[PDB]
Homo-oligomer: A and B are copies of this chain.
Amino acid sequence: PTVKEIKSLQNFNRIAGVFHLLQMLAVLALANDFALPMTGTYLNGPPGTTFSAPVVILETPVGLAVALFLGLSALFHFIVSSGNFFKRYSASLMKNQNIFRWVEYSLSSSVMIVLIAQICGIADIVALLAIFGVNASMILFGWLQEKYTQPKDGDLLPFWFGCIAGIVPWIGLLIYVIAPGSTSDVAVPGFVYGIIISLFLFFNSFALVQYLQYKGKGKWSNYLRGERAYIVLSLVAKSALAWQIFSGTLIPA
């Protein structure tokens, strides 16, 4: 990695940040008022005898959440292209690691997965909190893998740990989509299936990019290819998800 290659990333990051900011502003300006509940069912006696009717504790608005997980990326991409921050960024890239990315992801991906789970029909607060925790744990495992190992040496243990700890939310989503034991006759709409399938494919793409970067082939021996891939996939995923919720839920107003 020479000076010019690290120099172009300034303009690359600036362009990404501008795109994110414009999309956030449009979504804030056009969305209507929609909300989804967080509930809870309490006991009314001994530990396993009698329950009570569910009640609503909180209500999430959707437009603000979408604007939130776009604004986070916009803010971070503008921070990286700053002054002394860029000096530390280049110094860390020279050492084959990046820290800003994981700090961004551990919040953005968690918000995404919470919203996706909430649309499918999950309302308990503890379920959402634990899903948040699981996703953050997966990202931290990726951070540890990047920090403690070296390319082409054949050690891939934290990668496998992160793969193990990132499949639980999708098992839960599958369970609520199959819906065992229910008594109903209303079928799931189509945009739910579209959202689920598309986001699963994007998550698989992120994992594959990590694996190919640390395998060390004859072409992927350069770190900047993986850096560019991580920027582009992040720019695509956010836009692919934010405009599927808007068209179908937030539009009739």
Binding site for B on A (CB under 8 A): 34-37, 40-48, 51-52, 54-57, 119-127, 129-134, 136-137, 140-141, 144, 147-148, 157-158, 161, 164-165, 168-169, 171-172, 175-176, 179-184, 186, 189, 192, 249
Query: How many copies, total?
Result: 2
Q: Which 5 residue pairs across A and B have the least CB separation, nearest first?
A: A130-B130, A133-B168, A126-B172, A137-B137, A43-B121
Interchain CA distance A122-B130 in the complex, whole Å: 13
- The answer to whether B129 and A171 have CB atoms under 8 Å apart is yes
Interchain CA distance A51-B39 in the complex, whole Å: 12
Enumerate 23 A-B pairs (CB-CB under 8 Å) in ascending A order. A40-B181, A40-B182, A41-B54, A42-B121, A43-B121, A47-B120, A47-B189, A47-B192, A48-B119, A51-B123, A56-B181, A122-B126, A130-B130, A130-B134, A130-B168, A130-B169, A130-B172, A133-B165, A134-B134, A136-B164, A137-B141, A140-B165, A144-B161
Interchain CA distance A175-B37 in the complex, whole Å: 17
- The answer to whether B121 and A124 have CB atoms under 8 Å apart is no
Interchain CA distance A161-B48 in the complex, whole Å: 35
CB < 8 Å: which of B44, B57, B127, B186 contacts A186? B44
- The answer to whether A182 and B42 have CB atoms under 8 Å apart is yes
Interchain CA distance A126-B168 in the complex, whole Å: 9
- The answer to whether A181 and B133 have CB atoms under 8 Å apart is no
- The answer to whether A175 and B125 have CB atoms under 8 Å apart is yes
- The answer to whether A34 and B55 have CB atoms under 8 Å apart is no
- The answer to whether B184 and A42 have CB atoms under 8 Å apart is yes
Interchain CA distance A134-B129 in the complex, whole Å: 11
- The answer to whether B176 and A55 have CB atoms under 8 Å apart is no
